[model samples]
Target: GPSAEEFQQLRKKYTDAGQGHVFAFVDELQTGERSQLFHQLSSFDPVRINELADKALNPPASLEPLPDIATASILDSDPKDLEQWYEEGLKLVAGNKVAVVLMAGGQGTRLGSSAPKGCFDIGLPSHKSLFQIQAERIAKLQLLAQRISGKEAVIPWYVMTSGPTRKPTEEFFEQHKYFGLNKSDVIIFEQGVLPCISNEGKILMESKFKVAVAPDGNGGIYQALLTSGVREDMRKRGIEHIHTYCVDNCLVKVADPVFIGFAASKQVDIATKVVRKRNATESVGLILQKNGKPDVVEYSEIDKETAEAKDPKQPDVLKFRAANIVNHYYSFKFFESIELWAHKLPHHVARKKIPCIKEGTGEFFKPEKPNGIKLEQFVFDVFPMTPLEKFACIEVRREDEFSPLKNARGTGEDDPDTSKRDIMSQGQRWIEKAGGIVITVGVEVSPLISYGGEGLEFLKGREIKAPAFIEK
Candidate 1:
């Protein structure tokens, strides 16, 4: 009945990034005789703050099945035989056309750094930024595609950036000459943000035109894909297979072999990468059948029914417990499915510092603690978009592939600094075992920086060291 601005005004009242905004919304709806619309806001409650966690942890039944080897060869892979198979995969990726989608919209607040998360140096000794590390890895894969598949390393790179880090991220790449990749081939897009609100329901303003905010989480990829025009842009460039991974993982195998091969073997629209869990207490999402459909249940959400389920009759072929690391490969059709569906799963809430407006006086509001809903999406949310088709699982050396920098400050045994250092240290150990020496010079490898040092040509008797940006 009210003008469209009335809804916008109401939404804005709660759009602040902190407690103040929340209180304001409450104040307005409950203000005097005009409070009827206030009680009518219950529909939003289905997607609201208090109950978000329960909804996110309890997803509707999944549509995935533990892959079968004979009937479906996607999950059946051998680590030893992966190299050749992976090389073949390069040809497949080349023919099908491949591109990369990077979710780089986050700031480095969690790591206690002010720069973009991609800008933080994870490489010890040499201190390479996250972006540099991933860039190098993509470069190596492209080179391999060129040399082996007779293509010119044409896979375009697409990045989804957020308000806080977009410009700096762009300049960082430009400043470094795109880390030796073609500048034209890289695509950057802006992701949408939900306003941060106070507990009182008033909007918070981070700036004049902007509201204090948080990303809608990766679930935002749906909007980001449509808003950024990635499909049209990527298709115009003849790109297909899209490798997506977050920035926090120091050891994510981007465009990996077993992953790509398995996805290729199956004529499916989407595939997710998951690591096997050694126990029920593992720290990631567990992939299992939800009402006979394959789904990833968060580690925290694995209740008695699924957590205690016994291993399948054939353990190796039918392993049930897997930790989802959020790495994914989505075909164009998969993206299309989400676009057409326009369906969004429920949003999860996080108590975060948000600024807002006052309830009745319209004065500004602020909150010190996490005070609002933060919608998060498991990239796996798209798993249900397609029919009961193929989804693959491929294993990598867990230690080498799953190092995450998620903890706050701690000793050498606890801090992110220590954990990341530990990964490089382990890699160095492996290199030494393979008879290769890590050059004493400072060198930190990142998928964004040196692509985990795959840039260095492996020749006998060659010593590699820290801090050198080399691409093979």
Candidate 2:
């Protein structure tokens, strides 16, 4: 630990910035905990904390002009045209210039898990965790590209975790032998954590040795990439392009080749994979344009006239159907361009009921109501930063590509039940397409056996029983 003089200096420094209260119980900490808190406090920018707290408490009325949104042109190309994109993406993979950044950074709470969401098993016949399924998907993709290009490929899996999740996520993968991929290829790094603030713009302490904190949000990826040396790792691997998506989506195609190729063909700063909105009422964010710039607006935020409007040509389809799925492709150029742009992204506030420590008793208690603010940056906020000309949007079939396990079981959509059902239903469709008969309602297909429907010819004209797995 630093001498008392160092603590005094920082105390005065934070006192001047009005955040010194976080250190109020420093004397209550033991030697080891004291040092932890000391180092934590040393790393903070008290002035920035005060500034963020002020913004959280007195957020300026949003000046987002209710701009008229124009129809987004989705790149839904035919397979004949996409063959080239598939090759372009495959070649990059073969060249070992592609990677995946799995955004698994949320605090593990809402999903009824004490660990990272990726560790939850969605009830497949293979009994694979989300992490395992995602890993195998990459393994399968690498095999696919390697075979097609006649060159070996390695798709690095960069798991972006949070303060509470990094340890469990890392150890879970380790416990599973990095989910059958080389341990070194599964690079895990934690996103940044920000101090929580009270309504009166004061920094809150979680304990004598800790400050209440939360992950800086998925947008923290930009900052984490450089600070965590993930950028250098990608550089060393010659990873020139990246596919990033969240962990909740059980159906995410990790480092999806089609997506990577589509992004490559477009040569854009950012390419997003979207699904047609379920209806005019779905609350997902939509890919739209404002003054010709690529923009996204939450469904609830848009006026009913726009969200409910029907496409004249389709007649039944909503005018705004391209819904964001948080799946994206980031070229190295786009990655490099965002290095300094992250700090400038707008901060939003979430009024969460954060646990608070009782300084004198060394005990913690839950809040009755939201007692503090958790400042966060939306990952999509980076969308507007890309030039409209450098932005690309593509649509995918929802059933094939977009089931997110966002809730616990027995809840409505996106819970474990829906997620597992989607997996089974998708597997059934793949089997049916291959002219196979599915005799059971509980069949599962392992990614190691088939990335999608390919190689399912073995199942053709065959009857597969339920509770059975198409394993490698």
Candidate 3:
């Protein structure tokens, strides 16, 4: 067990905190089993657990009310401005001052797959997984920077996984040879997981041998970057900025030069890409000022009046039109200044249907309804830390860059079908924009040929067949 004295201490600590039940099977277990359980138990802070339990069970009555929110000032990506940003951003990339961070910690459970979400194909013509497309985009960006500077450049890729998907994600990356990225430049790190607690405030056990825990929300990114040595690695690589995005964004422009250059030119602490909300009722978060700081307010949190509010000068647009799509560019200086360890972000509770083991028999069974709480921190929670003046928001065209694969096919929205259609439509638009016509059921473009529709002048005044693949 945990050395006789250590075992007694933990038992007393948990028992005193009203979570002694975690040790229910400790006595019946073999040495190895007992050791494993204790190893997990050793990290527990009984006092903190009880504190969280009390807070969850009974919220404080006198909570401070939120201040009036204002729509964030967003920058338009006009063609003239884009050209300047692209040149400036490419300079940093060529200087090896940019890095990419991919948050791929989610599983594909919603898509009916047991693998990581990055591995899902999203029904593309080449059957490329989300990870492949993202990696190829990075390669193409690096090449773009190289071509711009006529020098070797490497913008390292950091893929963040979670406890449950780490192994599968790493293996999948290896299986595909990291989607053609240089092995040395691709680093995969894991985010931390926290124990799941019952609504009554007690931690639940997934099994006799394991604790029921979940990924500590993407808000855990700050802590993960520190503990995983990614922050330090960025310094080692002379990285000044990080472009982070969720893996499920099928149309994500990885290491997007225009976005990075815009942030650099403005010298903002953080710059995030956003698209206009489709309507007042859309479920996406509204990026705006909360108490005079940049914040993302959930659609449900605002009243209909506030959500439906339109611009006074131009009533055609929503007052709060910037919809957060999780595409963010953060300055390394600003990231380092945050007191993440000293001042922790608040954890929100998620009521979920957690599987549990029989109290005595240890037989695991899934519950039909929510039986427990999972605490997580949102990445946007850190926005309040940055100064309001230093926050920059970029308005993007959704069709060109914001399609995310979030559901299974049958739902008909934010699913693989939508992602595939968006990809093909984007490719066709690029061809036509470059003065070429594509006629077919579907069209696909290889990332190796271009990044963000650039260098496609070769296709000008040409005709291409649909269901065709464009390559080098």
Candidate 4:
């Protein structure tokens, strides 16, 4: 039970002029619930909140481009060396040393679907959902690795879902029979949520009994893994590396061989995959080194003059070397060395429109204007914590690996139409490279057939038309 002093403390700060409604609100919440809510509410440090707001409004000075040697290009590697990397990468997979941690906590509201983002159909010819597409890719990779290593391999899939999307996502997986992979190999966990608060740091109410809360962003995965015992699960399964990526990237290669190989070859604890910015002023975070330390800075944090600046040596190229694609590889050893979940990462503040109850009337209404501040931590915030030598980044062609399905239809590259076009285009390229002519038709290649344009020799000399799916 909350002491009278605790109740008075909350009423003094959050109540409507110390109205009687506070008592009733507290009464509605049981002792444990009220105590928990009170703790969450009182824990909001106004000083810290205001400091974040100040930082956002007045971002720090612009960052300079990293030296050429600090970043690597996949294109620069020798052909033979690249092949060796692929072989090494396959061995890692075959040894069951790699797992994938998918950040799928986002909902499909942006895509006009009420289901989880993974459940939305990408309009593929196979009519496969994003979840199915990714699962098949993982399955195919496992089989390939097993054959090469002469050992059985199973790539565990770890999905981080949100409170609203967790049950639906699990049901979708169950209904699909775990996308033909062993059900036990897939582990789904939910991310943590934090209550939305007013600028004054008062917690907003979604209803009489509910606090307005939202997913704590992908960074919550670090804490979620610790709380859910996923960290231990990975260790118990002999998993050493985790290929983490966002759910919206339709072309993502789950446990990409080259990437995994490169990370292992470099002996890096954390390696990020980035793409050259489409153009200056593109809205994406830039991977740079600050004071010789590698970190990412969001576009919003950089001023126009700094963001659009070009390289002195290459006038047409943006000085900001690499744009973050949110794809990364995390070594289990690094997670342990950093004590990842135990340390508190930096939190960012966002102004959002939150629904809340009228203080005096106790009536709920949707606000037309920004009514609250949402605090979220990003996974990239961990970069600065790692030593510069232990961190590395690889840049890939944007068209090959970075199409995201973030919008409904015609918004831009992140929309469904563009994603579908990119995938089909990739499939066409694979067929053409294999000496198969794709004649003005859509080409769909299952990852099960060739994870990355491999094993396409069979399609040699074959003329294919659009709307064609090539499989072994």
Q: Deviation in angstroms for 135 in model 4?
A: 0.8
Instruction: Predict model 2's lDDT versus the native.
Output: 0.81
- Residues 17-113, candidate 3, lDDT per residue (tens digit)? 8888888777678889888888887876878877776776676811111232212222433678778888999999999999999999876566777
How do all the candidates rank in terms of lDDT, highest first? Answer: 3, 4, 2, 1
Worst 10 residues of 2 by lDDT: 61-70
Off by over 4 Å in 2: 61-76, 280-283, 298-319, 358-363, 440-442
| lDDT scores in order | 0.60, 0.81, 0.82, 0.81
Per-residue lDDT, model 1, residue 344, is: 58
**Candidate 2 TM-score, true structure as reference:** 0.91
What tens-digit string does per-residue lDDT give for candidate 2 at 184-278? Answer: 88889999989888777777787767888889888888989899998889888788898989999988888877778877776787888778788
Q: What overall lDDT, based on C-alpha atoms, would model 3 receive against the true structure?
A: 0.82
Model 1, C-alpha of 165: deviation from truth (Å):
1.9
Q: lDDT of candidate 4?
A: 0.81
For TM-score, candidate 2 versus 4, the one ahead is: 2
Give the Å error, residue 7, model 1.
Answer: 12
For candidate 1, which ten residues in a row score worst on lDDT? 38-47
The most accurate candidate by lDDT is 3
Error of 4 at 307 (Å): 2.0
lDDT of 4 by residue, 107-223 (tens): 766688789998878787888888898999999999998898787898999999999899999999999999889998999999988767675556577766557888887888888
